[PDB]
Design a protein around this nucleic acid. Structure first.
Length: 94
RNA sequence: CGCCACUUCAUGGAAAUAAAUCACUCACGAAUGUCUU
């Protein structure tokens, strides 16, 4: 397999700084670095150094020398562009 | 429920690498091989 497709459900409203665009959704520049660390941690059974050695062994690293990055491409897109906008404050008001 | 903001604004790597460096053609052709006293 070359492509992985997943459908995400939202439980809490994300605080997004680029809400102006109608296609504003979860940013992959945030997901990918955390997912890379999560997978390397899981590959090494809770240790990121063993997990990097595992990824280094099976040629899964973009660079074998200095980064945790894994060689995959991540894209997050909206299917239906209808969204709910929330005002989140720490003060009650009518 | 009231009141109230601060902080952070680029670093590391790559900075040219290989292929072709002259090729083909012409490399002398024609006249004179003695002439006039």
């Amino acid at each position: 397999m070359n492509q992985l497709t997943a459908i995400l459900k939202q439980h809490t409203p994300m605080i997004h700084f680029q809400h102006n665009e109608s296609g504003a959704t979860l940013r992959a520049s945030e997901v990918k670095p955390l997912l890379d660390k999560f997978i390397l941690t899981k590959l090494g059974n809770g240790d990121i150094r063993e997990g990097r050695l595992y990824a280094k062994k099976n040629n899964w690293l973009i660079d074998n020398e200095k980064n945790y990055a894994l060689n995959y491409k991540l894209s997050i897109s909206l299917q239906k562009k209808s969204r709910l906008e929330y005002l989140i404050t720490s003060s009650t008001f009518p």
